[PDB]
């Protein structure tokens, strides 16, 4: 079984997948909080407490992170409590097949690379991924598999300083679609903001990418996917997005192990 | 118009205003 | 529109030179009086005069449509005029004040009822479940006003509501005491198999039409709600007595109430939902004009009273009363608990022409109003 | 002289308008930010610094502000050091001649309500009302002048989690237009993120509401005015929006003022 | 067994309770940090480590929680992890059988609603309920058993900024009886403040709703009672309260359970 | 006229007294933020900004601060931009005139010793000072004007678990409805209560303190009035006490 | 076998040792966060994930922290947990056969007690002790084995104002030797900073010592030992540190746990 | 007069300059916090209150910011407020006569520009310029006039989390020379660690230039330069800086000031 961790600045989910090329899938997913000052023990206890019996049945581990001191440690982990499994960690601006069109590739992320490695994989023509975390990210793959960039936007949020008014005595408005884009109190207000308020940013950042980008227009195959926590929530809400593919950056990590291997 | 209004209207007030108001018993109904 | 309505109205009654009077040998001399000049009395409009509790008691003939029950009310009114009238002109007889009250601010409460004839059919759990946060909400159209605050009125302060503060249980049976916000009363006086009669006796006695006019035709238009089985259930109240007081006791209609949902609502809010879904179902339905025209005034109400209060001063009772009470206050400097306020609230339902402090804004032109004197004194000898 | 003060959660706009009805003009203003905790005495200072002169010239104030403990404290100092000048000072709920048709008109902030106030007393018909300020606050006015609700959103800003990982070598993005949607180095991607996804998010919420709310469907006439800090930023980047009122809420506070005079 | 689960802002209680109805006790009892972005995967981690053998011998789980999305992970964990176990999950307003007589009863905390249902299941009578938690509660119950009410105050702790003004040289300092009410040195005089100022602080409130509200005087038989951690720091310099029930929470959160059930 | 300085960890009182002896009072007073890391040159406009035509008629200073960079910046301050002034600059433990019965008199804080020096100034006989600053302080002076230390509490404050704060005010009752009134009803309630509770405890427990002994309470500071009406143990409120103890100070040292 | 924990302000070391006397070795070892809030309750959670099956074959334990609580809730989970081992805990200003020469010696940091008593076992001469933690700590002991007192200064690290300022887009500077002293970028600069000012700061106070304390000049026979998880780091950069002992601190724990048994 | 303002990441120094060439002489200086989110209103605020009758008597402005958002703000504030006074206003990587011999010219700080050429305009020779700030900054000049690089370490401060564990009940330690570097007590120990160790930081990183560096050996002529708030405590303690330089900023922004105009 291969162990895919996948590390962002706020949570990290874990995967175990198994069998190879076409057949992998996703048997077992886990997600945690990224701490960003963990240390190479305090991860290995989660890990395997996570994993259980099939830490002896791992054939190998990829994984990448954001944060790069988790990936010193996720390294220093898997090579103490992991030392008979390969394992292929991977940096920011990494030579994955996919190349990078932008003016310093070494800056950027490893998810947004692996993310678009595995739509482009996937649907073998222009693409656009959109990843809902604790940013959202819109990346952009042209027809020969070429990463040309993208824009990155807050995540999806209520407002910070609206929450922040509110005040102890009221507790937290949670994130969920109201009834009605016109809100009639503050928690549908704040909600109405959140849900339909992002599925419009998204939704303009696609739409302008497609009139401008030579190549993207509606006249073009192009695959516009999503993937990440928050996308099924506002994936009702959305209009240009045409597919949802909850274990996009697993497979991308599965592909990249299987290209270093 | 105000000051018209609260004239004329407290030309009619009953005289004694505190008696005539303890005066008023009412027996309970429905 | 087409639901059987009725009113009973218990009308307070002095005499102010004779504190040892008997309330009862008062209200029974009212009426007799009335009958003789005419001629348990039942009048020719079809009416009942009579004596219940102590008070005189007029009945309205049944009506169908609101605005038929708002001019044999004041057509009530009026018999009551004319019958402390012929019972003064009596030599040597002990002078008879009459007022269209509920309290004597000293914890004495005495009703006027309103009866809705509704389908046996329906479950009477949907009407206590859909009618409750109307009855609560509606007080701030039809709220009469009261000075005072608390059963006894120990506490200083305008309300909406007379009735208010005898409010205990959210449905009852008893109308003497612990009242309720539903009343549970059943005796149909027609076929029990397929009609009800709904009881209600939160209502403060009105004497601005467009008051009675809206207490009337939107109750009807509501219970109309009930019976198709449109839902409400997103409108019940976590606490529907506490919600009486806590709408009552706000005359800026700012206050809210918890809603089950933990939603919380202005009273302004609840009428403008149910008027909503009443707007829906009518416009569902083949064309009612009266049915149209009081939607259009219940909306007209509501736009005015959420823009400011006093721009009903001259259609509704309890801004008008508040117009004349702040007036007061600010003229003489007083504080809530001054006599002369109390006495304002008190004389604002005076049934006499020249002395009822409404009559006299109803004379001057500073209220509004939907029928003419010609029809009330018409209904005043004629049945509807 | 008239001197308005509006108090948000981040900053406050002081502002000096003479004449009078629709004579009135902002002749002065001022921004500075709001500090929760200020003390009558500090204000004071500020004030008086920022107004100078005028200071003997004012004939009256009209404040309002989001943070309830401010407004305390503008009570106490114009009292103090004013105490000859008629002031207005305005409350979550205020009714303005402006109906609330919401649940609970006390939790309506009185900038909404003034914004709203103001578009109507511009335009007299239906309005959408963009305010960009700590938040995005689109508000919903009817062509009878009733305020209907409306939606708060996040205001406008680079994503945070990518700021805070860029580490202090590299804070502050200079949310500024970039050259293309699709960013190529990441200070370009975040700034497209920003820019171009909030104008999106404004240009979403303003269609679902005139494609939702009825009387505010394209073929109504609706007023789409913008206010606020950052609104010229993104007026560039926005379909639905047809002004710009800069002294918005300003003149809004003058006419409170003048209902109640 | 009955897994039991109170989560507060700052610490969460697990117990085990073995027996019904009047023969239900307590077996074995856990504090650990409320931590309020756990998620369901982490938390599944550490209840089955605090728990071990006994986790395939639950026959049920119980669960409140002062902060909701710990609750709402709660719920994802105890059907993924323990899906053949019955739960109930306790939410603010619960209907308990004991009625909330206050304005808003779904804004009421689950934590003083179970408190006060268990109080009178012992007590039967009017009780007056102290929780020493990081805020102290103090709810009021009827003789008829109706919630009425009470007042929320800070927990016991020494001045923060009295620590926070003593420098790392000297965090806060313990929190320990001192040896006089009169300190004769800073540590001793924080000491004196916390423990006997809010041992005065708890007296005065009793004593104000027994002397103020209707059916609580001296001469009414009122059951006082006190609960958490702080709770046998405080008891001996209390003269207002008569019982200590450490397991007041947990016995509540049974009878909830064992009611739904 | 004295220019007199009251630096708190959270606020700052500055006042300027005229007169002398039993003759000084407050004739202007002012409260402002205390930023721990405010310069000299910052403090200098500010207090120039509060006293105004004022600053040519100083005939003097005195200053306390629990905040020592603030002291700091303070004495820099009124050398550079009040050079002719004499200025007189309170520390913790100091000696003025009242003794200081405790372990270590070089800890106690300078706001703590000049409130019991006024208030034995004023009464003359065994007394219990409560100032309501950021902490509550509850100090106690013998009969003979010495120290004998006290106690110290938190502040008045919302309970933080129960992000913008609840406004701090009293409810109608002391059994809250909802959510506001419960925290209301908690802090002012309760902290009312534990002063109450201490000064009793001291009362009961510190000999020449009892109910039968003569004994002046007294309280100062920004949320004394607030609690006031809920107290029972405190008969007096001076609200000038601090800044009379600095002009007492001021006295002593001129 | 002893398990030895020392807990410091920012992580805690956990040991396993082996043998008595000089025959005693660290046979295993952890590192974890130190958590100040951290409960008995998930500290066994932990140390019971670290150790794994040598659990029951503990014979001893010996802990300290610079962290009140921390030590607390140790006593406390040794108690519950551990409760047939015998264990030794520290204190501040603990007699281990170590005199404290300084002003109070209740107030002198169990770990600079340890670290000198291990120092000055395995050397029995003066030496001057450089731990890298949390803050670089400099202790001295005099050739009779008297702890005279010492320095502490700022960890190593990279300036705080350059990295928050450094801002997110840019990401954090790694703590890694440059090239060159004289940096030609960002990150060169930061890293030449922290990297060889902090060894000049390490030399300069060991020679300050030699020179101006009797008894440490360079004629004098000292030893110079260095202990921590930064320095590694350091000392090829270092002149006057003649030794590196991982295990100072273990060490000196098990020598205070076999003094007290 | 000129007007010259520096903004640093946490304190700005204001100064006024008559004079031109050598006769160029700072006549006022004052020092402030920055509050890296003033607006240009506040600014102009404390920028008049503190130069007073010398607001009318301004002859030119010279400014430079290390936070930029601070540029914008003065700018603006220039613009309004001083409209006749000419302006030269700095950005990193700025062409002041000085070539910035690195990587990427445009990442270097202006203030380290403005001082060493200052430093070199005085010195004519090869130079190393110290700057206590919020960080160390040590400057390399050749002899020919170019800007090489250098190093940027922390400020001198205590140790944080000595100060941190210190508690509340302690107090702060103050920044000061203790009597020895052996202390006797926590204070004295992190008085000895700061002041000392950062004199030992100062020490290596000028000693490291001048023994790695091409043309700064002992052996050449080389003009080591101090400047800074914290400078005079640590001047003391250096052995390898020969000249203290309080007004090298300001020198640096007239030479600028002139050289554009």
């Given at each position: 079984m291969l162990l895919a961790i996948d590390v962002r600045n706020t949570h990290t989910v874990v995967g175990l997948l198994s ?5 992998a899938?996703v048997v077992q997913q886990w997600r945690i909080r990224t701490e960003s000052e963990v240390t190479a023990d305090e991860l290995a206890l989660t890990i395997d407490g996570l994993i259980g019996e099939d830490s002896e049945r791992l054939t190998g581990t990829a994984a990448l992170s954001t944060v790069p001191s988790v990936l010193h440690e996720v390294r220093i982990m898997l090579d103490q409590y992991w030392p008979s499994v390969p394992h292929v960690l991977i940096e920011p601006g990494v030579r994955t097949?996919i190349?990078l069109?932008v003016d310093n590739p070494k800056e950027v992320g490893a998810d947004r690379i692996v993310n678009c490695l595995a739509a ?9 991924v959109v990843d809902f975390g604790s940013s959202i990210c819109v990346d ?7 990463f040309?960039g993208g824009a990155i936007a807050p995540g999806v949020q209520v407002s910070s300083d609206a929450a922040a008014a509110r005040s102890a005595?009221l507790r937290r408005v949670e994130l969920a ?13 704040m909600?109405?903001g959140a849900?339909?308020?992002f599925?419009?940013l998204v939704?303009?950042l ?20 999503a993937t990440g926590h928050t996308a099924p929530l506002l ?10 593919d909850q274990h996009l950056t697993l497979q991308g990590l599965r592909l990249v192990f299987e290209r270093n291997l | ?30 | ?384």
């Amino acid at each position: 079984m291969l162990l895919a961790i996948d590390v962002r600045n706020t949570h990290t989910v874990v995967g175990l997948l198994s069998g190879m090329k076409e057949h992998a899938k996703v048997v077992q997913q886990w997600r945690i909080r990224t701490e960003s000052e963990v240390t190479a023990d305090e991860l290995a206890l989660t890990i395997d407490g996570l994993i259980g019996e099939d830490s002896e049945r791992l054939t190998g581990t990829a994984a990448l992170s954001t944060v790069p001191s988790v990936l010193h440690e996720v390294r220093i982990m898997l090579d103490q409590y992991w030392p008979s499994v390969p394992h292929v960690l991977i940096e920011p601006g990494v030579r994955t097949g996919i190349p990078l069109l932008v003016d310093n590739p070494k800056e950027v992320g490893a998810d947004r690379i692996v993310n678009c490695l595995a739509a482009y994989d996937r649907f073998r023509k222009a693409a656009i991924v959109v990843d809902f975390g604790s940013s959202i990210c819109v990346d952009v793959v042209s027809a020969k598999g070429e990463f040309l960039g993208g824009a990155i936007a807050p995540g999806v949020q209520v407002s910070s300083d609206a929450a922040a008014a509110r005040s102890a005595a009221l507790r937290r408005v949670e994130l969920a679609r109201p009834r009605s884009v016109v809100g009639k109190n503050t928690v549908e207000c704040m909600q109405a903001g959140a849900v339909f308020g992002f599925a419009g940013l998204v939704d303009g950042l696609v739409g302008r990418i497609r009139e401008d980008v030579s190549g993207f227009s509606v006249d073009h195959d192009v695959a516009i996917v999503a993937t990440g926590h928050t996308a099924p929530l506002l994936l009702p809400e959305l209009h240009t997005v045409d597919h949802y593919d909850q274990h996009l950056t697993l497979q991308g990590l599965r592909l990249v192990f299987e290209r270093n291997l | 118009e105000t000051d018209d209004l609260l004239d004329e209207i407290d030309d009619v007030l009953e005289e004694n205003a505190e008696d005539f108001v303890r005066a008023y018993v009412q027996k309970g109904g429905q | 529109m087409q639901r059987i309505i009725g009113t009973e109205v218990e009308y307070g009654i002095s005499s102010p030179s004779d504190p040892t009077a008997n309330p009862i040998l008062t209200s029974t001399q009212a009426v007799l009086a009335y009958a003789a000049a005419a001629g348990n009395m039942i009048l020719t409009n079809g009416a009942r005069l009579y004596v219940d509790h102590a008070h005189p008691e007029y009945s309205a003939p049944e009506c169908t449509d609101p605005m038929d029950a708002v001019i044999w009310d004041k057509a009530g009114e009026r018999v009551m005029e004319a019958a402390a009238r012929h019972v003064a002109s009596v030599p040597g007889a002990a002078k008879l004040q009459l007022y269209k009250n509920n309290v004597d601010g000293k914890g004495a409460s005495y009703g006027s009822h309103e009866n809705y004839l509704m389908s046996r059919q329906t479950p009477f759990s949907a009407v206590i479940a859909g009618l409750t946060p109307f009855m609560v909400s509606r007080q701030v159209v039809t709220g009469s006003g009261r000075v005072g605050i608390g059963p006894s009125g120990d506490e200083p302060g305008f309300q909406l509501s007379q009735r208010a503060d005898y409010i205990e249980v959210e449905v009852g049976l008893e109308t003497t005491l612990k009242r309720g916000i539903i009343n549970t009363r059943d005796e149909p006086h027609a076929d029990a198999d397929k009609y009800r009669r709904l009881h209600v006796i939160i209502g403060d006695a009105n004497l601005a039409e467009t008051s009675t006019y809206l207490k009337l035709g939107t109750t009807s238009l509501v219970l109309d709600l009930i019976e198709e089985g449109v839902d409400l259930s997103d409108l019940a109240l976590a606490r529907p007595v506490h919600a009486v007081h806590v709408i009552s006791r706000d005359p800026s209609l700012r206050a809210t109430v918890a809603l089950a949902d933990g939603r919380e609502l202005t009273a302004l809010a609840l009428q403008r939902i149910y008027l909503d879904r009443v707007a829906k179902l009518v416009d569902s339905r083949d064309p009612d004009p009266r049915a149209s025209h009081v939607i259009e005034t219940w909306a007209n109400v509501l736009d005015l009273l959420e823009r400011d209060p006093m721009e009903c001063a001259e259609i509704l009772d309890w801004p008008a009363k508040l117009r004349l009470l702040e007036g007061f206050r600010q003229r003489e400097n007083l504080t809530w608990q001054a006599p002369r306020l109390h006495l304002v609230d008190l004389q604002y339902s005076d049934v006499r022409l020249d002395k009822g402090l409404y009559n006299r804004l109803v004379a001057r032109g500073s209220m509004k109003r939907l029928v003419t004197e010609q029809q009330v004194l018409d209904a005043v000898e004629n049945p509807p």
